[PDB]
Design an enzyme around this catalytic site. Sequence first.
Site, PDB file in Angstrom:
ATOM      1  N   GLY A  15       0.821  -1.206   0.000  1.00 50.69           N
ATOM      2  CA  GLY A  15       0.000   0.000   0.000  1.00 50.69           C
ATOM      3  C   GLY A  15       0.858   1.260   0.000  1.00 50.69           C
ATOM      4  N   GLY A  55      11.036   0.023   7.433  1.00 46.06           N
ATOM      5  CA  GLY A  55       9.616  -0.270   7.542  1.00 46.06           C
ATOM      6  C   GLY A  55       8.711   0.424   6.534  1.00 46.06           C
ATOM      7  CE  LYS A  58      13.886   0.452   3.469  1.00 45.58           C
ATOM      8  NZ  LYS A  58      15.027   0.243   4.409  1.00 45.58           N
ATOM      9  CG  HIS A 257       4.413  28.637   2.903  1.00 42.32           C
ATOM     10  ND1 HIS A 257       5.124  29.683   3.451  1.00 42.32           N
ATOM     11  CD2 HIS A 257       5.167  28.157   1.889  1.00 42.32           C
ATOM     12  CE1 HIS A 257       6.267  29.821   2.804  1.00 42.32           C
ATOM     13  NE2 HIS A 257       6.322  28.907   1.851  1.00 42.32           N
ATOM     14  CD  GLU A 258       4.593  23.643   0.335  1.00 39.90           C
ATOM     15  OE1 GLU A 258       4.476  23.018  -0.746  1.00 39.90           O
ATOM     16  OE2 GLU A 258       5.623  24.301   0.655  1.00 39.90           O
TER      17      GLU A 258
HETATM   18  N1  LIG Z   1       3.711  -0.197   1.880  1.00 40.43           N
HETATM   19  C1  LIG Z   1       3.377  -1.223   2.652  1.00 40.43           C
HETATM   20  N2  LIG Z   1       2.238  -1.905   2.434  1.00 40.43           N
HETATM   21  C2  LIG Z   1       1.882  -2.961   3.211  1.00 40.43           C
HETATM   22  N3  LIG Z   1       2.639  -3.398   4.241  1.00 40.43           N
HETATM   23  C3  LIG Z   1       3.806  -2.790   4.557  1.00 40.43           C
HETATM   24  C4  LIG Z   1       4.244  -1.643   3.762  1.00 40.43           C
HETATM   25  N4  LIG Z   1       5.409  -1.226   4.287  1.00 40.43           N
HETATM   26  C5  LIG Z   1       5.711  -2.055   5.338  1.00 40.43           C
HETATM   27  N5  LIG Z   1       4.731  -2.976   5.500  1.00 40.43           N
HETATM   28  C6  LIG Z   1       4.699  -4.068   6.501  1.00 40.43           C
HETATM   29  O1  LIG Z   1       5.782  -3.959   7.452  1.00 40.43           O
HETATM   30  C7  LIG Z   1       6.759  -5.005   7.218  1.00 40.43           C
HETATM   31  C8  LIG Z   1       8.186  -4.460   7.237  1.00 40.43           C
HETATM   32  O2  LIG Z   1       8.450  -3.864   5.980  1.00 40.43           O
HETATM   33  P1  LIG Z   1       9.845  -4.066   5.237  1.00 40.43           P
HETATM   34  O3  LIG Z   1       9.606  -4.530   3.822  1.00 40.43           O
HETATM   35  O4  LIG Z   1      10.785  -4.855   6.128  1.00 40.43           O
HETATM   36  O5  LIG Z   1      10.242  -2.518   5.204  1.00 40.43           O
HETATM   37  P2  LIG Z   1      11.736  -2.108   4.862  1.00 40.43           P
HETATM   38  O6  LIG Z   1      12.207  -3.174   3.905  1.00 40.43           O
HETATM   39  O7  LIG Z   1      11.598  -0.751   4.227  1.00 40.43           O
HETATM   40  O8  LIG Z   1      12.403  -2.119   6.216  1.00 40.43           O
HETATM   41  C9  LIG Z   1       6.422  -5.603   5.862  1.00 40.43           C
HETATM   42  O9  LIG Z   1       6.694  -6.992   5.820  1.00 40.43           O
HETATM   43  C10 LIG Z   1       4.948  -5.342   5.701  1.00 40.43           C
HETATM   44  O10 LIG Z   1       4.195  -6.452   6.200  1.00 40.43           O
HETATM   45 MG   LIG Z   2      13.941  -3.260   7.272  1.00 42.60          MG
HETATM   46 ZN   LIG Z   3       7.810  28.082   0.630  1.00 43.92          ZN
END
Ligand SMILES: Nc1ncnc2c1ncn2[C@@H]1O[C@H](COP(=O)(O)OP(=O)(O)O)[C@@H](O)[C@H]1O
Ligand SMILES: [Mg+2]
Ligand SMILES: [Zn+2]
Lengths: 406, 421, 411, 421
Positions: A15, A55, A58, A257-258
Amino acid sequence: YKPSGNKRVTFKDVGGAEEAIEELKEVVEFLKDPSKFNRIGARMPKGILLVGPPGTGKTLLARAVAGEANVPFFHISGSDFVELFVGVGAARVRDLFAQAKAHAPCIVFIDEIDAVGRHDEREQTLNQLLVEMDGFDSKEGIIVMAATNRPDILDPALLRPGRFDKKIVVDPPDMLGRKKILEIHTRNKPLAEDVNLEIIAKRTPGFVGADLENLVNEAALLAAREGRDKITMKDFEEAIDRVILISPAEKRIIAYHEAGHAVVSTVVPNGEPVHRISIIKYLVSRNELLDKLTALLGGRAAEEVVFGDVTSGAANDIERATEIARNMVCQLGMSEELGPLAWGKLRNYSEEVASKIDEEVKKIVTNCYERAKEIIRKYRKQLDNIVEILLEKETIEGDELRRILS
Amino acid sequence: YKPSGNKRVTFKDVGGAEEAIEELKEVVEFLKDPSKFNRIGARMPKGILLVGPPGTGKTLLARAVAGEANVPFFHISGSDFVELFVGVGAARVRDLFAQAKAHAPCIVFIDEIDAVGREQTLNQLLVEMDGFDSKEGIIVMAATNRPDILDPALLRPGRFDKKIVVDPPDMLGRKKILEIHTRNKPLAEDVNLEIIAKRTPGFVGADLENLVNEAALLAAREGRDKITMKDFEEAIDRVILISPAEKRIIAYHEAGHAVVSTVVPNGEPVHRISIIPRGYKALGYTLHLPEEDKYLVSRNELLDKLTALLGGRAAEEVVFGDVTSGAANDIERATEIARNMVCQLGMSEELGPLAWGRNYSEEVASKIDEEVKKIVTNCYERAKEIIRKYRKQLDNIVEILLEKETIEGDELRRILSEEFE
Amino acid sequence: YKPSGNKRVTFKDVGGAEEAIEELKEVVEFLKDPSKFNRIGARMPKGILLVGPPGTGKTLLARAVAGEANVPFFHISGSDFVELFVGVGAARVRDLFAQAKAHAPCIVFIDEIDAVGRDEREQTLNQLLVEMDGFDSKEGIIVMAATNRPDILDPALLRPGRFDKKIVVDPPDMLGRKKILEIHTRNKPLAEDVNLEIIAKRTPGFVGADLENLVNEAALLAAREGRDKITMKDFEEAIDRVIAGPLLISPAEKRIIAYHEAGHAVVSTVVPNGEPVHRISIIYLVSRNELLDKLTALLGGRAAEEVVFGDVTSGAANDIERATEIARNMVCQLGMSEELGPLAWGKLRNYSEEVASKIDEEVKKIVTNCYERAKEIIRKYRKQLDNIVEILLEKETIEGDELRRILSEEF
Amino acid sequence: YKPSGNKRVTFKDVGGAEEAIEELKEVVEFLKDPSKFNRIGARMPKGILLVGPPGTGKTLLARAVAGEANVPFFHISGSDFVELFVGVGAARVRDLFAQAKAHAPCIVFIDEIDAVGREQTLNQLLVEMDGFDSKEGIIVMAATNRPDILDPALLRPGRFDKKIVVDPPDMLGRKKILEIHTRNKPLAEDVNLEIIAKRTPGFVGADLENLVNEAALLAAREGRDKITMKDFEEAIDRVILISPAEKRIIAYHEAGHAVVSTVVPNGEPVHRISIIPRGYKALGYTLHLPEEDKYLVSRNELLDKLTALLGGRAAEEVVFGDVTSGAANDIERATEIARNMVCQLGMSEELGPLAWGRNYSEEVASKIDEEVKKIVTNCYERAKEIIRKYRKQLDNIVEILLEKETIEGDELRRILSEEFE
Ligand SMILES: Nc1ncnc2c1ncn2[C@@H]1O[C@H](COP(=O)(O)OP(=O)(O)O)[C@@H](O)[C@H]1O
Ligand SMILES: [Mg+2]
Ligand SMILES: [Zn+2]
Ligand SMILES: Nc1ncnc2c1ncn2[C@@H]1O[C@H](COP(=O)(O)OP(=O)(O)O)[C@@H](O)[C@H]1O
Ligand SMILES: Nc1ncnc2c1ncn2[C@@H]1O[C@H](COP(=O)(O)OP(=O)(O)O)[C@@H](O)[C@H]1O
Ligand SMILES: Nc1ncnc2c1ncn2[C@@H]1O[C@H](COP(=O)(O)OP(=O)(O)O)[C@@H](O)[C@H]1O
Ligand SMILES: [Mg+2]
Ligand SMILES: [Mg+2]
Ligand SMILES: [Mg+2]
Ligand SMILES: [Zn+2]
Ligand SMILES: [Zn+2]
Ligand SMILES: [Zn+2]
């Protein structure tokens, strides 16, 4: 080193990252059928670097690509390679790629790459990485994806063409984006019919995907604790405190402002089209520069008009605006009285000229300021609607804005 | 970089700072086994800022924390990065944290943190701070006697969001510090540290450690094996306060800051006032601290903040008819804010929304000065209207201040409320 | 340090850079067989400096020379040397040349040299200087270096015996863009509707890197739709893409540039002491009159802008700078001013504000006079101005017996 | 320092400078056995100054002298001392001469001597010069294309009291230089250096050596074993004069200097005038040379000297109605002398006997400028009165100059006398 035995994920499971998904869809088309690119010479990148705070999804992303193309996924962690005995690191990298080739097409994913992509055995381990990247046939349908929240650490040899020369920035989700991530992590849970995910989104500014998954979980544990078989809105409300900033007065101001920059930009004939607002040419003509200066001052113009008070908020805009004007006057020959001359470059001119320069510069910026103010006053109602939306959603698109400027 | 090889210290070795030990006992509990906090989500700060004057044991406490948790301790000095060539500063910050993690759990100490926290070097610091995982057992501690000079970005949450104030020690605290630095010294029977603590008003730990050494030297000079009371008496005079009319003025100055801050609508809540010579708990200092809560500030906020800064001086003039050097730093701070309003924030009438800065003519230089003087003067005269208007409250607050010396929390608020209800 | 393991290239892979290739031919022959030169004591330079904007094929030429001579190519980046720990940089340069000698003949190529040659950087560079001075040209080693930032270089690097030869690598004009597309297209399947000329013409401002990416973006568009041939529509669309990813010249801007360049051309021609004008493209002892003429011509582009469009653009900024350099020099050095007399004012200013003020007035007066005179000329020869632009927009570059005659038929 | 290990050279290897070889043949006779001169008291110079434009073989001749006398040769560069730390410059001069004596007889060469001879470093040089015994077989040679910049103390007797002017070579001299740098090169039969000398007006030795290399390269490129005439033709265009209306102006400029200098009462005797593009024999250069004869100079002397400096420009304006860049250096020199009169010598009306220098107010800065302008202007207008008054002589001198190119001694004096008798 073998194909990950973890749950299949697709983009339906990510998401708030539409921009990134869109960039990765071509990579997915490629993994499903590399021959479509190979036969016309469409070359794909061998390495894609995912940049963003922890989180944000990625890893999820990397996994979704694999799942969407129905291809194996090799998950490696870069922090594994630090601390290794002598040589062991290189040998692991070699074997990793050997496997990747046996199983192509596929995605090879290296988390926390900075840990290895940075003064001893790391050199060996990294040099090997570099050699293997250089070594493998893209056409085989191999793509190495890599993630980091710390891109300025990376050895620039990694970002060179032929390696990790595609970066995809993954940001914290806006309000809609957070709403989707709640949908996702809620699919499989029993919600009461009173659960308002939009409100929960609204009340979670700053949360990243990992935080929201947590919140949902805390919701679920709460109900369970209490022997209940549906998660209710009070459960999510209570949960938010558990997984736990900027004033709403300050939010207002930032928004105006934006919106200001956006409204003026749009109205001014030569402005830069506005692609997105968020609250988280070769040759350029005199009119172009003035219209830009004026846009630059809209933020402040909107503060003055709407609040009467002004804030430190527009410090950088003022600097920018001033810089342009000084340039018009001293380098671009675009002043009334001072002529088509280069004044300066340090200072090689008199106090009499120094003083004229300040008047003209002041004159230009002041004139643009006032112009911005007229635009804001003239479009006050729509400015207010824009802000009204911006506060709610946190970000809004140009097409939308131009619309509201009906 | 390589962890300190300096002698391990514990709280056993720090006297006159029981309040600070209290707050740090948690940190020690964390360093010894970060898992107990991890397991139940107890989130510790990533940064602790030690504030107080020099020689009050700031560095000491840091090391006491590290010794008490038997964890490694990295001592860096702030003034070691300023003066470095292009990039060197950042890469040293990098290395620092790279080492920190390899030896976690551990304490990273950055003395004279103002030195770096007033571009590249700090920016790097900031990114490391937020880059490291609290849960790995890493706590960065920093010291400064110049908290007012720090970039407000360092005090943002997720960084140095907790700070401990270390004050000069009173008589009882001095006695303890004397007892500590005398532990392994041979004292004559006649030696009474009590009297020595009483006769050393204003002395900090550093100064007391020094007095003690100067006593030893007087003994050694004469070839003696016990340090006598005469030796301590004599030593004081080698190293070398406030008057009950000067006490008054300080009182009126601090009351001043208090009264104006309370009355002015955008004023900074007042949590404590104090007349301890140089406690960093005084409101006079507080007012000089950078805004850590907000990002934006409005012209009226600044005008109100400016007016509070000048309240100490306003009080002195109104009540005494003249003025003292006491307000130099307030004046300097007021003036910086005015210049900034005028040359950076576009908050002046005549100068417009322009960034001036030098890049500009004598004729502008002059308007700027006129404008800055205008702001500060008007603000100064506002502070005086307020003092005069609230003279009785001012008088009342002094009366207490003179007596109690330091007013802190729930009590401070009763009195401001009674007085301005 | 090892020789590169990338694909060997030749001049068959460089497009639109004929002048550069011709100056480099000597180098290729040298590296193929140094004895040929050593035999008659033809001394080659030790270092060649390639100057030009990013993505113009500075690296490509260097590789092309190595490839053409079938000699090893060391590819170094200057950006690697800055940021390094104490000494590590000097020792690297030392290794780098040790290897050079052990693989000679060969090319050592230093990209981004301005990163090293703008404490520690001092040592690193110092070391470079030593090695340069320190190797035998006869042994077949050439060091080439690239930069789009030459003004920032330490002049020690440009001394005789070091990087004492420079080749400028310009951005490609229409025909050159055409060739770069053909090159990057050799091996790809194009639809029969694809006209690389047209696409050339639509991509003014584009450098080689930009065009290669263009072609790859065309390919990705076909591939995404599963098509087996790249179509014109794919290229057309690709343009809009490369743009919004990481400067095309608009047609409106093309127009202005044209008038600007045609302006210099017209004024230069009309003015009696004008500098003959050999080419126009969208991409000892002097007298006062000579200097006012030169000044007048320098202001012609701007004059053509003002007269024709009314507005004026940032495009005359350097011409303004240069014009002003001239007027100050007339006033402060050559004693050519009305009121300031035969005096040397300056050398760093050692004069009162009263004089400083007179100087500014006198300098403003000269430049303003020449500017107005430039406009009188543009207006007077608007017709020829317009004809020159018309042609120029067609070809983008007008040159030689073709520019020879155009100026005649017109004047 | 350690004597040159560069290939030995003789006059065999220097073309187009027979006049200079002449004067230096004595030096060689001295270096080979200083005893023949010693025994009968023939005192040689301690310093020889080589003057001429760059790439004319100044350095070469020095080494030719050393090779011809088979004596060691120390090559120092003037620009190697500027930029050095406190003292380093002097101690290097010390060392230089310490080495010189240990290896006497020998030649010490100091290229770009203007670099050092415009404090400590020079002062040291001066003291060494006078410190060493000529009779030990030591002759210091120095080169410069900037003789006008040298401290007059270097040209005092017992130092660089003789100087040799090395000019760009005419066609015949160019041919010789071509022949020398082609000795060990493989020429095609068609190669005619004659034509090449004729087609290379203005080229110096350095440039010709370079043309030759560029020819070789064109041959090598094509893999050929003989350098052809086409190769030389083509080379010229790779490396790349005066007009018969520009010739005129130069003529009028130099005549100008001549006429004013002769007429003005304190003028510097005129020994030669020349229109050779950049011969340092011209009067235009001479006038820019520092006074080597006198120590004192009077205000009228300076005014007369100033007026001669502006005579070249005076001539151009009077005769042509406008002015060229030709007089830039004269203007710069005139102005320095004016400033000096006013700010150092106390030679101004309004400013008094005061040293101004900046140390002083804008109001003074302004009077200084007024005064300096006054002097130079008056002097300029004097030069024009003179030109106009002696127009016929001016015309006559040009006529000859155009024809003869360089007028030298007994002949120059006949003509100035006929003309101003
Ligand atoms: N954009 C997202 N949509 C749905 N779930 C997410 C999203 N971002 C993080 N999460 C949840 O949190 C968990 C940790 O994300 P992770 O892929 O490890 O983030 P990063 O790799 O950026 O550290 C994921 O396994 C997922 O279940
Ligand atoms: Mg991570
Ligand atoms: Zn400005
Ligand atoms: N509270 C204290 N108790 C005992 N000794 C102290 C105390 N404070 C300081 N000292 C002594 O004086 C020194 C204070 O210097 P330092 O640690 O730099 O403190 P600060 O950081 O406040 O300058 C300590 O090394 C210690 O020997
Ligand atoms: N003149 C050209 N002809 C063909 N391709 C070119 C040209 N210039 C650049 N390219 C393409 O783009 C790339 C340009 O990169 P590079 O040679 O690094 O340019 P620079 O060194 O000037 O930045 C080359 O690898 C080549 O594929
Ligand atoms: N008169 C000459 N005859 C032959 N070759 C010459 C002559 N003058 C100069 N050259 C060549 O060109 C170079 C001139 O450089 P240099 O010795 O520095 O002269 P200068 O001191 O006048 O600059 C010499 O090294 C020599 O190879
Ligand atoms: Mg301290
Ligand atoms: Mg490049
Ligand atoms: Mg020379
Ligand atoms: Zn105060
Ligand atoms: Zn131009
Ligand atoms: Zn002259």
